[PDB]
């Protein structure tokens, strides 16, 4: 790897600089290099890894959606033929997106998840695994679509089982996991009722635990709770 010669601490320092500069591709390459040093990641480092790749794939997902919409319009009745270019370029963006998802899933499999024993790290990584299979599912169309969806579901479910046993209902990782599993149900698995039920139960159980929290933890938890509420308002 091109980062093999750089110190772990230098990679982390540069990842933070890249974040400040909004250079998320650089940030992701630095954090990939840090992961490949083979040591477990701290909480802050796990968050840097996620921020970097979420922003990279986020740009690709937004582009893919624009191109897919153009492609779908080109396939309506009355639309003039324009040749293979729209499909080709959508496929180019899609392949690059898939490559990023595969890179992240590779890092989680070699060897972040197997070395993660504490609930906060293990749930974070399993959530990430569900998320990047979900992003793969958003563009999947062929024989592997069902297996991609089930890989996302399985990762989220393992994370949910751990989070319910080991974390308080207000924990931001537990909340963000439930939020994203609910989005998976609604947008990927054609299960809007499950999505709504999960969002509601998650929100209500967090509400009843807010009284235990400091001012700062309250702000962290309520920020994610508002996203659950926003989704429920959209879906109901």
């Amino acid at each position: 790897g091109a980062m093999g010669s750089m110190e772990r601490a230098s990679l982390i320092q540069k990842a933070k600089l890249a974040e400040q500069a909004e250079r998320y591709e650089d940030m992701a390459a630095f954090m990939k290099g840090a992961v490949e040093k083979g040591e477990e990641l701290s909480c802050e480092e796990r968050n840097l890894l996620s921020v970097a790749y979420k922003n990279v794939v986020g740009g690709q997902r937004a582009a893919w959606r624009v191109l897919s919409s153009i492609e779908q319009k080109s396939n309506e009745e009355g639309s003039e033929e324009k040749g293979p270019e729209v499909r080709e370029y959508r496929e180019k963006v899609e392949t690059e997106l898939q490559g990023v998802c595969d890179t992240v899933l590779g890092l989680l499999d070699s060897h972040l998840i197997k070395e993660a024993g504490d609930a906060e790290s293990r749930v974070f990584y399993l959530k990430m695994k569900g998320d990047y299979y979900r992003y793969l599912a958003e563009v999947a169309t062929g024989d592997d679509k069902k297996r991609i969806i089930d890989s996302a579901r399985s990762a989220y479910q393992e994370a949910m089982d751990i989070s319910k046993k080991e974390m308080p209902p207000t924990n931001p990782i537990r909340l963000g996991l439930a939020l994203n599993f609910s989005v998976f149900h609604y947008e990927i698995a054609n299960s809007p009722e499950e999505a709504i039920s999960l969002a509601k139960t998650t929100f209500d159980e967090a509400m009843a635990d807010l009284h235990t929290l400091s001012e700062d933890s309250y702000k962290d938890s309520t920020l994610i709770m508002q996203l659950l509420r926003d989704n429920l308002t959209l879906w109901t």
Binding site: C43, N47, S50, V51, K54, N55, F124, K127, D131, P172, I173, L175, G176, L177, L179, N180, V183, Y186, E187, S217, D220, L223, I224, L227, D230, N231, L234, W235
Partner: peptide
């Protein structure tokens, strides 16, 4: 729909 922020405490 909104998904989670990347950074979670």
């Amino acid at each position: 729909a909104h998904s989670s922020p990347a950074s979670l405490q």
